[PDB]
Design a protein around this nucleic acid. Structure first.
Ligand SMILES: Nc1ncnc2c1ncn2[C@@H]1O[C@H](CSCC[C@H](N)C(=O)O)[C@@H](O)[C@H]1O
Ligand SMILES: [Mg+2]
Ligand SMILES: [Mg+2]
Ligand SMILES: [Mg+2]
Ligand SMILES: [Mg+2]
Ligand SMILES: [Mg+2]
Ligand SMILES: [Mg+2]
Ligand SMILES: [Mg+2]
Ligand SMILES: [Zn+2]
Lengths: 1182, 224
RNA sequence: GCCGAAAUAGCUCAGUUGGGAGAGCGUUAGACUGAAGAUCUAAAGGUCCCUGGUUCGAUCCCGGGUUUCGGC
């Protein structure tokens, strides 16, 4: 999709005054271009613009028509957003203007840019900054313009940044506006850095005089950068970018260049003498001098120091080396003090950058630095300590940065000991030995060993212990260690092959390689346990086969023998050989290796062997044989007749697979086969119309017969009483067929169409799949029925569809608890194919198929609502028969299901949708009032159990309906209604006293709360914080007589707090969390007051939930220690409740700190961490 | 599983009922029981089983107690309270002057957290309270069934229970989840110590309250 | 010979804008009890086909290449 080009209206006459009816000039081309809609021919005419100007290189003075043409071009360019490719298109086009026309274009485009820079609308600033950004990249027209307007562009940037800061500090309270303003700040700062880096004017001094307007604008920009760096209510991206900019400007603006490294050093050490810096620096960077800057400020300043200075070639010299060491010292000092998660991630990135800079310096450094940067230095010791402490951090970015740091440390040592005699350095050997002492479940061991392998070569690691490959293979039966083991082994054998092809130059080396890496693999493939086989096949074997495909010939010959000897005996190694052979052959075929041979080989596979594999007892062997037949490297390779027969044989038996993973793999491979048939049928058709092989028309007939028979088998598999797996597989494969062969409908030829094979009876069975007790089957049947063409009333007469509607209405009011799901699916089907009866038009008062589905939904919802209103009134009268005859939750479920399918944001009959929503809310509240007293209290030919079922199911349905209605983006929903919904959720979920309405209300409340966060209305997005405060000050003075209950782990209050805390944007700001944890930790602390037990109880009940929620996740770490203290200090309290709550909270804390259990029983060392990690993460617990 | 369904299909308030029945057909708990005490019955499924298997005679008396409220049953008297508290113990024992209960069952468990050591700790506390109630109520040679959490170390609990009972057996019925570490200690033949009132007591009671061996300690070398 | 498309986790698929890569399924762990545990939780698994650039920083911008295809 592209955006149509537009133009200024008053320019028309301007371009009309030079246009011509004949159309010789460029002006007529502009007329033709602007009056278009397709953004494609415009591009063509844009290319032809250049020859038109080229064909007038004789006048010697620019034609006024050409002047106006280029002026309009410039105006259009400056009005084009960066999301429009046409902008880059005409940028590239005008890049090729003839040399005769350059000066006038220069001057006039300069004028246009200058008048652009004088804008004063606050919200138009971003467009201007984007324009300045564009004029820098590969656009010679704008580069000279901006080079001529440094003063003006700098002034604009400065004033825009100031105004954006003022607006942001003024728009406090609304966070969407604030986010937009932060983005504007960020683009402004980045553009300023681009300008300073990429303008051929800042070189030389030439402007450092105090009177230069450029100098004064630069000083003002520097002051703004310092002010925004020291600020703390802005996004951390803004502050980090500001630090980068500060260092860049200081490097640029400081006349005694050789003193730059020293000065910066002092700024980092907070030891700058206010009496020796130049006056402009003190004026602009007063915060940098005279102390008192945050730790974030120093972090971002040293980041900018590493990023924005020339470390290569030794330009900065000894002062540069001293600055490097000082930055290392400052970073290590900050490492122990920083505790915010995001700041920890930033520090990891900066440490990795420090290692890069050390690499660059160390490539030409002085001998003095070598001693201080080698592997035995103190700095490298601290870096290794950091790595060992952090390779298993929960945050992925932390771990990746630690891997980078470790690799760079090894490179640093290599550079320092270049005066080396024999390859194995003592430092490397010691590191390797120390790493080999770790257990094999330590994930950092694998990555560190991989880096070491690439440093010293795998021959030494093998010399230390030559059973390491087997040891690594033995852990490959544990998923979540498989990727690490696979990567380590791959690194190992790549290095080993490179080492063997060294000085010993022959062909026999491969033998040794094989016996090191393939023989253990074959043993595992033939005789390992099931999980080990599956994981080795899925993760490791493809890597080995891809790296060395000529090893396949070696493996097959070994396996084939073991197969044939089996027939000699009429052993386990001879028993697992077939599965291993099929796995190897599947991998080889799918990668196009030497086995790409037209029915999978001439002799590797026989009919007997394939049939044995396809029906083998082990799921893995069946899957590997199916994959050998189904998937190929070439996506249009012909399916042979043998493969079709084998696939039919396979389908006959493998539709009832019990493992969901196995079933899913089977369905995916079959879909791949159908895609191959579809794609090769087009090739066959093309050859057929192009008037050894078998006359492609024969193959097309074979394809048609094969697909028809496959459909026959799949529809036979839908017999009465068929299993859940067989219906799942049949419906999945049928849907895959419907999707794959629905491709060439814009095309001319299609080999197969599922719709042709659908009789009336097959349609009946597909609809009857709506009665299955499993919702997956209902969903699959619904999707497949919707994918078919000419189905709605083609297969059904009016009377039988009316019967179906009556049946759905009857199922919506049945006492069986799950019939309402079937009724909902039936009703949705009738709606989405316009098969409703005609009488339903009597409910509303009067092609866009969205409009007709909306009308159908409205009619059915109104019918359901009328029934529901009557039933709710009768339930108010007497709840017994309501539970017996017409439980009300079925209609609510059907209404919610109907609404769920719509796009609530894009309704079109709001005049009709408003009263219905009002009535819906009213009836929801009425029904909830009717059935709730039965659910908090006890019971008030109808057993009490079915009364309770009716009541709590109605509770659940009403909660889900309210959560659905909350997504109307309050309009159809007024603010009063949203407040009433929130009040309803608060009345429950805090007074339920029973398990019902704790997790019942939580889901609806979470939906409402997320919507409330995303809402742009300010009055609404302040609701969550206000509710949080209300419940917190309710907690403090709990007064045990209240309706809140202590049992069931709490009175739902943890659910309320969790839902409110969920509103916080993911990783965005998390300010509610800080307040809540401060208050709860304070409450849970020891209390002199005896009456203060209950506020201390609820806190420990809430805290527990907060420490196991997945959303809070890594934001909750800075509180763990405090919470831990509370739990422990709460274990010694005389009161029983405080101790019990402490126990539960402590359990949650243990799980959060040490992680989830890795295996069922042994827990050898899988959930332990070293003392160094534990007391670095929580140093206040030691 | 299947018993979660069968609880709803039949007249059982919870799946736990099927754990009690499957412990009869393998230990014959309801041989001649006439009065029984039910500890920690949340909905009352065990109380229901006892009422239908003992109170079906008509004279069967059943006392159920829990931290929460229960729906009343015909032939069972309900008490809400913490059996750890002494007041609840007293009001429970208040029901058994003269004729003592023939059977005491305890289905209690803390809020099971997932890591098993804390579960053993809390279950040990609950079992100590239940054992106190039992020894204070049931007739000698009686029966005591109690839910336990079989973790890595279960020898201490078996040692403590063996002192008060002739036979102690550990059983896991079919209805118990196979992934769960719960189990049931069935205690046959209540055989209280001779000098024990709710010599030998000085050694037993400290050891049953906790693994206290500060009764064999001596200030002089041991006799040979 | 030109012109154009696709490649993201074990599998199936999302990814405006340059600042931590998103979900579903499968897998692993936990659960004394209700309200199909057919449920709930919380973990684990990727650096975006490969390779050079631009940038303080690339899944995203630019240039080569590989594999599989479509059009003339
Ligand atoms: N200290 C305590 N005092 C009394 N009941 C307790 C208790 N700690 C836990 N419980 C009870 O232990 C039971 C846990 S599950 C009980 C299941 C019930 N017996 C049945 O037939 O299904 C709950 O009833 C809980 O209230
Ligand atoms: Mg309920
Ligand atoms: Mg994509
Ligand atoms: Mg999942
Ligand atoms: Mg992860
Ligand atoms: Mg660079
Ligand atoms: Mg790159
Ligand atoms: Mg071609
Ligand atoms: Zn000063």
């Amino acid at each position: 999709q592209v955006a149509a080009l537009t133009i200024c209206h008053q320019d028309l006459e301007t371009l009309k005054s030079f246009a011509d009816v004949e159309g010789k000039n460029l002006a007529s081309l502009l007329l033709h271009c602007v009056q278009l809609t397709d953004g494609v021919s415009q591009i063509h005419y844009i290319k032809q613009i250049v020859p038109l100007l080229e064909k007038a290189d004789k006048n010697g003075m620019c034609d006024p028509t050409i002047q106006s043409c280029l002026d309009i071009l410039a105006g259009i360019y400056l009005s084009l957003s960066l999301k429009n490719p046409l902008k880059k298109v005409l940028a590239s086009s005008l890049n090729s203007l003839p040399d005769f026309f350059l000066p006038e274009a220069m001057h006039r485009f300069t004028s246009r840019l200058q008048e652009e820079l004088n804008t004063t609308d606050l919200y138009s600033y971003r467009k201007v900054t984007d324009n300045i950004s564009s004029c820098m990249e590969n656009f010679n027209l704008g580069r000279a313009s901006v080079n001529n307007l440094l003063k003006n562009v700098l002034h604009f940037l400065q004033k825009s940044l100031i105004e954006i800061l003022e607006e942001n500090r003024k728009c406090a309270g609304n966070h969407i506006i604030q986010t937009q303003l932060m983005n504007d700040l960020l683009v402004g700062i980045r553009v300023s850095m681009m300008l300073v880096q990429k303008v051929q004017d800042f070189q030389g001094n030439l402007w450092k005089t105090s009177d230069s307007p450029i100098w004064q604008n630069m000083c003002g920009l520097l002051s703004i950068f310092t002010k925004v760096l020291s600020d703390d209510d802005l996004l951390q991206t803004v502050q980090s970018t500001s630090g980068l900019a500060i260092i860049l400007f200081i490097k640029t603006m400081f006349h005694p260049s050789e003193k730059i490294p020293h000065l910066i050093s002092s700024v980092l050490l907070r030891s700058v003498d206010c009496t020796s810096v130049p006056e402009w620096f003190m004026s602009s960077c007063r915060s940098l001098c005279c102390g008192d800057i945050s730790q974030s400020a120093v972090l971002f300043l040293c980041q900018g120091t590493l990023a924005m200075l020339d470390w290569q070639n030794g330009s900065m010299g000894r002062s540069g080396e001293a600055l490097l060491l000082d930055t290392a010292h400052v970073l290590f000092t900050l490492s122990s003090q920083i505790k915010e998660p995001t700041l920890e991630m930033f520090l990891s990135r900066i440490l990795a950058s420090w290692t890069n800079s050390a690499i660059q310096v160390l490539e030409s450094s002085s001998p003095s630095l070598t001693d201080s940067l080698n592997g035995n230095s103190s700095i490298v010791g601290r870096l290794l300590e950091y790595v060992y402490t952090h390779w298993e951090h929960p945050l992925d970015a932390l771990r990746h940065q630690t891997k980078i740091m470790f690799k760079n440390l090894l490179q640093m040592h290599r550079l320092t000991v270049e005066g080396a005699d024999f390859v194995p350095d003592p430092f490397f050997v010691e590191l390797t030995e120390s790493l080999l002492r770790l257990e094999w479940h330590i994930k950092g061991k694998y990555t560190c060993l991989g880096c070491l392998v690439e440093c010293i070569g795998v021959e030494h690691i093998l010399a230390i212990d030559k059973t390491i490959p087997s040891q690594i293979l033995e852990v490959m039966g544990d998923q979540s260690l498989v990727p690490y083991a696979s990567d380590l082994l791959e690194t190992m054998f790549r290095n080993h092959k490179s080492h063997l092809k060294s000085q010993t130059a022959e062909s026999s080396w491969i033998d040794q390689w094989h016996e090191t890496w393939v023989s253990p693999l074959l043993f595992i493939l033939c005789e390992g346990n099931l999980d080990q086989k599956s994981y080795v096949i899925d993760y490791y074997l493809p890597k080995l086969l891809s790296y060395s495909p000529e090893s396949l010939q070696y493996m097959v010959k070994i396996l084939q023998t073991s197969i044939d000897a089996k027939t000699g005996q009429e052993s386990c190694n001879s028993r697992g050989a077939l599965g291993a052979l099929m796995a190897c052959l599947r991998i080889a075929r799918a990668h196009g290796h030497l086995q790409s041979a037209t029915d999978t080989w001439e002799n590797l596979v026989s009919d007997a062997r394939i049939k044995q594999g396809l029906i083998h007892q082990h799921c893995q062997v069946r899957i590997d044989t199916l994959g050998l037949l189904c998937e190929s490297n070439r996506s249009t390779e012909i399916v042979s007749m043998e493969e079709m027969q084998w696939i039919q044989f396979f389908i006959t038996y493998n539709l009832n697979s019990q493992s969901p993973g196995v079933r899913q793999q089977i369905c995916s491979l079959l879909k791949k086969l159908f895609c191959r048939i579809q794609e090769s049928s087009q090739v066959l058709y093309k050859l057929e119309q192009s008037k050894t092989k078998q006359h492609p028309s024969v193959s097309l007939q074979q394809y048609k017969n094969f697909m028809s028979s496959i459909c026959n088998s799949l529809f036979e598999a839908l017999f009465p009483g068929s299993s859940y797996s067989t219906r799942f597989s049949a419906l999945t494969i049928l849907g895959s067929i419907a999707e794959v062969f629905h491709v060439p409908e814009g095309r001319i030829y299609t080999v197969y169409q599922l719709s042709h094979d659908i009789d009336v009876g097959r349609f009946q069975t597909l609809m009857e799949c709506f009665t299955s007790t499993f919702e997956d089957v209902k969903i699959l049947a619904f999707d497949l029925l919707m994918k078919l063409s000419k189905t709605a009333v083609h297969f059904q007469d009016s009377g039988k569809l009316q019967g179906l509607f009556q049946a759905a209405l009857e199922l919506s009011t049945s006492t069986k608890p799950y019939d309402c799901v079937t009724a909902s699916y039936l009703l949705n089907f009738l709606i989405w194919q316009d098969a409703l009866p005609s009488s339903l038009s009597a409910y509303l008062t009067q092609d866009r198929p969205a409009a007709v589905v909306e009308r159908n939904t409205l009619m059915v919802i109104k019918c359901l609502m009328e029934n529901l209103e009557e039933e709710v009134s009768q339930a108010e009268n007497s709840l017994l028969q309501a539970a017996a005859a017409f439980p009300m939750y079925g209609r609510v479920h059907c209404i919610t299901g109907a609404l769920q399918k719509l796009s609530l944001n894009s309704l079109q009959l709001v005049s009709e949708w408003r009263p219905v929503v009002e009535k819906l809310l009213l009836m929801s509240y009425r029904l909830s009032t009717v059935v709730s007293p039965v659910i908090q209290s006890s019971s008030p030919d109808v057993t009490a159990q079915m009364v309770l079922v009716c009541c709590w199911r109605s509770m659940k349905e009403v909660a889900l309906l309210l959560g659905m209605l909350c997504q109307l983006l309050p309009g159809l929903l007024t603010v009063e209604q949203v407040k009433e919904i929130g009040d309803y959720f608060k009345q429950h979920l805090l007074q339920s006293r029973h398990r019902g309405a704790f997790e019942l209300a939580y889901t609806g409340f979470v939906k409402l709360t997320e919507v409330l966060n995303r809402c742009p209305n300010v009055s609404l997005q302040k609701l969550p914080e206000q509710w949080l405060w209300s419940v917190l000050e309710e907690i403090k003075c709990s007064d045990p007589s209240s309706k809140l209950c202590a049992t069931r782990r709490s009175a739902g209050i943890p659910f309320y707090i969790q839902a409110l805390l969920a509103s916080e944007p993911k990783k965005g700001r998390m300010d509610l969390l800080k307040i809540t944890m401060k208050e709860l930790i304070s409450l849970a602390g020891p209390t002199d007051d005896i009456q203060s037990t209950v506020p201390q109880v609820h806190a420990l009940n809430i805290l527990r939930a907060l420490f196991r929620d997945t959303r809070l996740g890594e934001n909750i770490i800075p509180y763990v220690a405090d919470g831990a203290k509370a739990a422990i200090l709460g274990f010694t309290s005389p009161v029983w409740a405080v101790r019990n709550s402490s126990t539960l909270l402590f359990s949650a804390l243990i799980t959060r700190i040490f992680g989830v259990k890795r295996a069922k029983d042994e827990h050898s060392k899988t959930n332990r961490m070293t003392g160094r990690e534990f007391f670095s993460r929580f140093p206040e617990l030691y | 599983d299947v018993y979660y369904r069968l609880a709803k299909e039949n007249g059982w308030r919870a799946r736990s009922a099927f754990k009690l029945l499957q412990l009869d057909k393998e230990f014959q708990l309801f041989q001649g029981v006439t009065r029984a005490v039910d500890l920690c019955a949340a909905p009352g499924s065990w109380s229901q089983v006892l009422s239908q298997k003992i109170g079906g005679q008509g004279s069967g008396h059943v006392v159920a107690v829990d931290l929460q409220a229960m729906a009343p049953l015909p032939g069972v008297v309900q008490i809400q309270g913490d059996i750890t508290q002494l007041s609840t113990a007293k009001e429970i024992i208040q029901h058994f002057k003269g004729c003592p209960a023939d059977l005491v069952v305890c289905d209690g468990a803390p809020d099971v957290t997932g890591l098993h050591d804390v579960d053993e700790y809390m279950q040990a506390q609950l079992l100590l309270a239940a054992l106190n109630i039992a020894t204070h109520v049931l007739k000698p040679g009686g029966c005591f069934v109690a839910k336990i959490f079989r973790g890595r170390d279960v020898t201490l609990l078996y040692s403590q229970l063996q002192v008060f009972f002739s036979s102690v057996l550990c059983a896991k019925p079919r209805s118990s989840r196979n992934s769960s570490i719960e189990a049931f200690a069935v205690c046959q033949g209540y055989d209280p110590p001779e000098g024990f009132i709710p010599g030998p007591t000085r050694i037993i009671v400290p050891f049953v309250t906790c693994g206290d061996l500060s009764s064999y300690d001596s200030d002089r070398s041991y006799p040979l």
